[PDB]
């Protein structure tokens, strides 16, 4: 979402440092899922857990997670919403129910729901201010970050076909 704005932020970031969210997910399956990334083996994206139900068709727990920004740099936080090909696929992965995701901060609030009918992951992003807490509410179809990002030193994001 707002892909160009986000891309530009990275283009001038100076580079990315990573830091764990510190999120413990008891009772939630976070195992490799997609074959699409077979190049490194059959697994999901390296740093973002799908948070599938512990077993197929099982209900997803209503989770509340919160992350306080420990540092003086704003945190770039990304989360995904999984759009299934069909209702049956969503049910298998996250159980039956009205899937709703809410993300909140001191200056942000947005709700999301997946729309079945096409396989896709929608990534959404937020810049979290220092001393603030990002609150997440999960009802399933939420691909959670394991780590967040911090920016270091004003890079130049060039798009080019030339050799180095």
């Amino acid at each position, epitope marked *: 979402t707002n892909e160009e704005s986000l891309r530009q932020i990275l283009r001038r970031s100076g580079g990315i440092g990573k830091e764990s969210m510190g999120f413990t997910y008891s009772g939630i399956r976070t195992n490799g*899922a*997609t*074959s699409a990334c077979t190049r490194s083996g059959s697994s999901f994206y390296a740093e973002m857990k799908w948070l599938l139900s512990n077993s197929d068709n099982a209900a997803f727990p209503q989770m509340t997670k919160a992350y306080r920004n420990p540092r003086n740099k704003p945190a770039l936080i990304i989360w995904g919403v999984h759009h299934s*090909e*069909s209702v*049956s*696929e969503q049910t*298998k992965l996250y159980g039956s129910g009205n899937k709703l995701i809410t993300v909140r901060s001191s200056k942000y609030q947005q709700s999301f729901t997946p729309n079945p*009918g*096409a*396989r896709r992951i929608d990534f959404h992003w937020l810049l979290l201010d220092p001393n603030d807490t990002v609150t997440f509410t999960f009802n399933g179809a939420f691909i959670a970050p394991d780590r967040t990002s911090f920016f270091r030193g004003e890079s130049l994001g060039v798009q080019s076909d030339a050799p180095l």
Partner: nanobody
Amino acid sequence: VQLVQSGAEVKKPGASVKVSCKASGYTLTRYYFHWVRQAPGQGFEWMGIINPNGGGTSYAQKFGDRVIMTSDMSTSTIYMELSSLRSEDTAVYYCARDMPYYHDSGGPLFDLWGQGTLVTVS
């Protein structure tokens, strides 16, 4: 190489049935799959077609809104759901892998057939 199907099932009228077929070997995106009924000593009846490339479906009016087909690319499964079961639905259900040969009519060419699943409603 193969299409294999779930075991025979018994259902009560008004209930739903799900019939599964698994594909081994070739990818699913190269073929269209059809469901065809083998009525118990009667001729074949076309139920519908599913295109795994995007899950698009089309159904014969004889079944109309009673049938929902869907596919699972991660497990290679083509399972079909039939709603509002009637005693007339007792039959052997086949999954067929149809090669897109008849470009003139979109007609099916049944290259490979599944084992067949017997569904009994009563």
